[PDB]
Amino acid sequence: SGWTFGAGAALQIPFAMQMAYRFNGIGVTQNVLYENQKLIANQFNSAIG
Amino acid sequence: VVIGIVNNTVYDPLQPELDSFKEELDKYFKNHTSP
Ligand SMILES: *[C@@H]1O[C@H](CO)[C@@H](O[C@@H]2O[C@H](CO)[C@@H](O[C@@H]3O[C@H](CO)[C@@H](O)[C@H](O)[C@@H]3O)[C@H](O)[C@H]2NC(C)=O)[C@H](O)[C@H]1NC(C)=O
Ligand SMILES: *[C@@H]1O[C@H](CO)[C@@H](O)[C@H](O)[C@H]1NC(C)=O
């Protein structure tokens, strides 16, 4: 759901949608993520190690 | 490269501006080409 459940009913949405919206929260549309989803989503995997 | 994309058609907002123009000119063709 993401940020939606702090107001009430939580809505089912895939994760790749969620942080793709947080890109819209800094000033760049989804073009940054999906055009680089393989690498971009892989870095967070290594950052946690 | 994008993941999750699905094939979908994109409509043209300019398309309705041209569909209403072809019908009018089709009638005149038969009135002058044959003779
Ligand atoms: C436009 O839509 C067409 C669908 O009519 C897309 O082409 C087809 O996409 C499917 C996606 O699953 C391909 O199916 C896969 O084919 C492989 C190879 O045979 C098979 O091993 C898989 O199990 C799966 O069935 C299909 O092959 C493909 N057809 C062709 C002719 O490429 C197309 O990608 C869409 N294009 C755009 C720009 O959205
Ligand atoms: C077709 O040509 C004839 C020739 O005299 C004319 O009278 C008629 O008005 C034309 N048709 C149209 C729709 O203008």
Side-chain angles (χ1 to χ4, degrees), chain A residues 34-35 37-38, chain B residues 1-4:
Chain A
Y34 302 141
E35 289 166 17
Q37 173 167 356
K38 173 70 183 301
Chain B
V1 177
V2 65
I3 300 100

mmCIF file of all heavy atoms in Angstrom, chain A residues 34-35 37-38, chain B residues 1-4:
data_model
loop_
_atom_site.group_PDB
_atom_site.id
_atom_site.type_symbol
_atom_site.label_atom_id
_atom_site.label_comp_id
_atom_site.label_asym_id
_atom_site.label_seq_id
_atom_site.Cartn_x
_atom_site.Cartn_y
_atom_site.Cartn_z
ATOM 1 N N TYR A 34 12.085 2.936 -14.267
ATOM 2 C CA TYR A 34 11.779 1.827 -15.164
ATOM 3 C C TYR A 34 12.786 1.724 -16.297
ATOM 4 O O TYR A 34 13.068 0.621 -16.778
ATOM 5 C CB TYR A 34 10.368 1.981 -15.717
ATOM 6 C CG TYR A 34 9.328 2.038 -14.634
ATOM 7 C CD1 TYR A 34 8.239 2.889 -14.731
ATOM 8 C CD2 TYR A 34 9.442 1.241 -13.506
ATOM 9 C CE1 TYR A 34 7.288 2.939 -13.734
ATOM 10 C CE2 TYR A 34 8.501 1.287 -12.506
ATOM 11 C CZ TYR A 34 7.427 2.136 -12.622
ATOM 12 O OH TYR A 34 6.493 2.173 -11.618
ATOM 13 N N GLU A 35 13.335 2.853 -16.739
ATOM 14 C CA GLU A 35 14.403 2.796 -17.722
ATOM 15 C C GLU A 35 15.683 2.215 -17.145
ATOM 16 O O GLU A 35 16.600 1.899 -17.910
ATOM 17 C CB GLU A 35 14.658 4.190 -18.293
ATOM 18 C CG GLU A 35 13.541 4.685 -19.196
ATOM 19 C CD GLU A 35 13.633 6.168 -19.481
ATOM 20 O OE1 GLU A 35 14.714 6.750 -19.255
ATOM 21 O OE2 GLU A 35 12.626 6.753 -19.932
ATOM 22 N N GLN A 37 15.348 -0.105 -14.131
ATOM 23 C CA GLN A 37 14.817 -0.855 -12.995
ATOM 24 C C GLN A 37 15.757 -1.975 -12.570
ATOM 25 O O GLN A 37 15.950 -2.207 -11.372
ATOM 26 C CB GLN A 37 13.435 -1.421 -13.323
ATOM 27 C CG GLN A 37 12.890 -2.354 -12.245
ATOM 28 C CD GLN A 37 11.416 -2.661 -12.411
ATOM 29 O OE1 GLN A 37 10.752 -2.119 -13.293
ATOM 30 N NE2 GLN A 37 10.893 -3.534 -11.556
ATOM 31 N N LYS A 38 16.352 -2.679 -13.534
ATOM 32 C CA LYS A 38 17.224 -3.799 -13.199
ATOM 33 C C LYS A 38 18.389 -3.355 -12.321
ATOM 34 O O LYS A 38 18.643 -3.941 -11.263
ATOM 35 C CB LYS A 38 17.738 -4.462 -14.475
ATOM 36 C CG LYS A 38 18.778 -5.538 -14.230
ATOM 37 C CD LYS A 38 18.162 -6.758 -13.576
ATOM 38 C CE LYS A 38 19.224 -7.793 -13.260
ATOM 39 N NZ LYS A 38 19.950 -8.222 -14.484
ATOM 40 N N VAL B 1 13.198 -2.241 -22.463
ATOM 41 C CA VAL B 1 13.989 -2.377 -21.245
ATOM 42 C C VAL B 1 13.067 -2.338 -20.035
ATOM 43 O O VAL B 1 13.348 -2.955 -19.000
ATOM 44 C CB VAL B 1 15.061 -1.273 -21.164
ATOM 45 C CG1 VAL B 1 15.838 -1.362 -19.856
ATOM 46 C CG2 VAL B 1 15.999 -1.360 -22.359
ATOM 47 N N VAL B 2 11.952 -1.623 -20.166
ATOM 48 C CA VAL B 2 11.009 -1.482 -19.064
ATOM 49 C C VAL B 2 10.357 -2.823 -18.753
ATOM 50 O O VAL B 2 10.127 -3.652 -19.646
ATOM 51 C CB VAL B 2 9.969 -0.401 -19.403
ATOM 52 C CG1 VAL B 2 9.130 -0.827 -20.586
ATOM 53 C CG2 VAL B 2 9.079 -0.127 -18.208
ATOM 54 N N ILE B 3 10.078 -3.052 -17.471
ATOM 55 C CA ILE B 3 9.448 -4.276 -16.990
ATOM 56 C C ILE B 3 8.011 -3.967 -16.596
ATOM 57 O O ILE B 3 7.732 -2.932 -15.979
ATOM 58 C CB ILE B 3 10.234 -4.871 -15.805
ATOM 59 C CG1 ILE B 3 11.663 -5.213 -16.234
ATOM 60 C CG2 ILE B 3 9.532 -6.100 -15.250
ATOM 61 C CD1 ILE B 3 12.690 -4.183 -15.821
ATOM 62 N N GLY B 4 7.093 -4.861 -16.959
ATOM 63 C CA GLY B 4 5.692 -4.685 -16.653
ATOM 64 C C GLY B 4 4.898 -3.962 -17.715
ATOM 65 O O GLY B 4 3.670 -3.862 -17.588
#
